[PDB]
């Protein structure tokens, strides 16, 4: 039986990067040839194992963390990387065993008039620990006086929605990013 990469990569809808969707993949054969030879994934490189060499090596648990980010911070999805998404939204550990697939999705996610469904965490007290999923939308306090969850000065809602437009440039287009992580029932 085949591993269900078709329900991840060819899915109808993704999730935003603060609530990044994680699905555990196990007890199946993972055919990676349809991923590498698809010729549609623009950004693809692999850490800890060569991508043409991981086809005949077997892991135990595979997590396919998937989200939608702007095309500039695809470089932020990397081990040992500092930035905005890599600190407040989705941090990869330094010992990251697995790899990242990012392809352009202007033709689906960037609708006419602006797409504001996708938000990213912008204000946070501390940087994220690796593989942390933060769902809380409490009104962030940046100053001394707490302001009890109402909007105002030094009271910022931490999720700023992306402005995704077909008019936007290549760096501002939405890129559906799928991140694979590896650790013995996921063979090739």
């Amino acid at each position: 039986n085949l591993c269900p990469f078709g329900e991840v990569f060819n899915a109808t809808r993704f999730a935003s990067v603060y609530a990044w969707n994680r699905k555990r993949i196990s007890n199946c054969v993972a055919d990676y040839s349809v991923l590498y030879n698809s010729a549609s994934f623009s950004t693809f490189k692999c850490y800890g194992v060569s991508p043409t060499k991981l086809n005949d090596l077997c892991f135990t648990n595979v997590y396919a963390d998937s989200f939608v980010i702007r095309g500039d911070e695809v470089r932020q999805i990397a081990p040992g990387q500092t930035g905005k998404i890599a600190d407040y939204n989705y941090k990869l550990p330094d010992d990251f065993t697995g790899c990242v697939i990012a392809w352009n999705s202007n033709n689906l996610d960037s609708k006419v008039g602006g797409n504001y469904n996708y938000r990213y965490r912008l204000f946070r007290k501390s940087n994220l620990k690796p593989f942390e999923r933060d769902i809380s939308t409490e009104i962030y306090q940046a100053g001394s006086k707490p302001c009890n969850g109402v909007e105002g000065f030094n009271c910022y809602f931490p999720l700023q929605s992306y402005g995704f437009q077909p008019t936007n440039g290549v760096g501002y287009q939405p890129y559906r990013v799928v991140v694979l992580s590896f650790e013995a029932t996921v063979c090739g």
Partner: antibody
Amino acid sequence: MQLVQSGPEVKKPGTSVKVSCKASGFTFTNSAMQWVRQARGQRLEWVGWIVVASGNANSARRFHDRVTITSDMSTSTAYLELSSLRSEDTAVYYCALNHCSNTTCLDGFDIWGQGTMVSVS
Amino acid sequence: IVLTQSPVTLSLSPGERATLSCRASQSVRNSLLAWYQQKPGQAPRLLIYAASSRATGIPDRFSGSGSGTDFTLTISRLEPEDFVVYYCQQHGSSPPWTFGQGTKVEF
């Protein structure tokens, strides 16, 4: 720790102004700039404020429909353009910033600009 | 929400004790009534933040006291360069972080 502002612009009652305010010595964190318009011989006023990291501008009620107060984190700047530039707009425009001490931010607009003699001639 | 300040000129001698007060017309939320001074025609600068705290880099002789609506700016030692227009703030509310009329510290 200095906000270098643009120079004066002598304008006309049909035109629009474009006042910039660059932040020197540091980069924009979640710093919440405000903008203060001073007609000479009058009190200070309030134009609007930008959360610079978010870009959520919010202008005052008499300025509700004809000033857009934009910011750019890439250049570490924050702009202002006021529409229709009436004869009761000859003033000095002050970009006031709240200092953020990383771990947190302050509650006071301490570092200011230097002024912009927006002249309506 | 509008902020009214108190006496429009402090016409009294240098080198003594003066009190400055901002009588708000609506109650200031979270006590955010920072105090600025502005010598006429030049850039203002901050003295009191969060309605009581002394600012960083600013020396002594100023004091913000009280919270809510009753409010005091306490200047201790009027040097000749403290004869300046002094301003409130209400950047606490939402919109119209309304200033004051100012006053005139006068000899």
